[PDB]
């Protein structure tokens, strides 16, 4: 058991997720209604703050001891 400076971030793998297409905003014309979306699989939209992947840390924070 001994790991280098960036084994500290890899996930038994790498960010294959980050290179992916954005969500598809599916649309249909009059007469059609796309069936109601289950909130169980909604994804909120955010301001895009902070880095991502191994550029973003996962070392646990430290509270007032």
């Amino acid at each position: 058991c001994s790991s280098d400076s960036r084994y500290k971030r890899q996930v038994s793998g790498d960010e294959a997720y980050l290179e992916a297409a954005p969500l598809a905003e599916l649309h249909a014309p009059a007469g059609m209604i796309l069936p109601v979306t289950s909130g169980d699989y909604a994804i909120p939209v955010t301001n895009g703050s902070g880095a991502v992947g191994k550029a973003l840390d996962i070392r646990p924070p430290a509270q007032p001891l």
């Binding site: 014309p29 059609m32 069936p35 169980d40 699989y41 909604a42 955010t46 996962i58 646990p60």
Partner: protein
């Protein structure tokens, strides 16, 4: 004991754990943090000790015990501001269950072998993002959530295909309607839609085929 030094003040043991983490020697760090956890179910470093233990189990890839420990920590602690990191770790754990060594080498799609881990990771990352959208880890979380929605969509697409080749046309209708009720917003499901049209033809459901025919015609490019 597991190579425990008879005792030290928690300052020194926790600093030695930091050194082992810097060393990346997850195993010895695990023994030290287990010792501290049993030493201090409460105490000056207890919560911190469990945080490091989560990170340590995870980096040693002892994932099931990692998930159990995270569950224990969140069971004990609902109030601590840093719980957002704990949510991210729970999600990342269920994420990390989604790999196999020879599959990671060979690169054939992970898509359609197990949805369970994926659903759990999706749920917990979604709870993180919707509950603590100001937290550091949220942006990485949403990128992971797009990847996970794609994962689930591809799993359902594979089920649609193998039901299709068998001819379970009712089942394929229901499953594609599922890919719309849930996560309608992926390339995968946009690619799944023609299955519904074909299936309706295999069931002489002309008008319903007309309804779906509206969608596929209108979406090869955005409208």
């Amino acid at each position: 004991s597991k190579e425990e030094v008879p005792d030290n003040p928690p300052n020194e043991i926790y600093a030695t754990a930091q050194q082992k983490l810097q060393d990346g020697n997850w195993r010895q760090a695990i023994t030290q943090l287990e010792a501290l956890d049993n030493r201090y179910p409460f105490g000056p470093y207890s919560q911190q000790v469990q945080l490091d233990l989560i990170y340590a189990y995870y980096k040693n890839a002892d994932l099931p015990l990692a998930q159990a420990a995270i569950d224990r920590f969140i069971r004990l602690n609902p109030t601590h501001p840093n719980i957002d990191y704990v949510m991210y770790m729970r999600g990342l754990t269920n994420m990390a269950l989604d790999d196999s060594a020879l599959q990671g080498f060979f690169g054939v799609d992970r898509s359609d072998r197990d949805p369970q881990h994926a659903r759990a990771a999706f749920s917990d990352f979604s709870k993180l993002v919707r509950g603590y959208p100001n937290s550091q880890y949220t942006t990485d979380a949403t990128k992971r959530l797009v990847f996970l929605k794609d994962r689930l969509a591809k799993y359902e697409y594979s089920v649609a295909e193998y039901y299709t080749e068998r001819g379970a046309w009712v089942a394929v209708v229901n499953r594609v309607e599922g890919m719309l009720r849930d996560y309608p917003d992926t390339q995968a499901t946009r690619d799944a839609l023609p299955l519904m049209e074909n299936a309706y033809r295999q069931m002489q459901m002309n008008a319903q085929a007309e309804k779906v025919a509206k969608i596929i015609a209108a979406n090869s490019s955005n409208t």
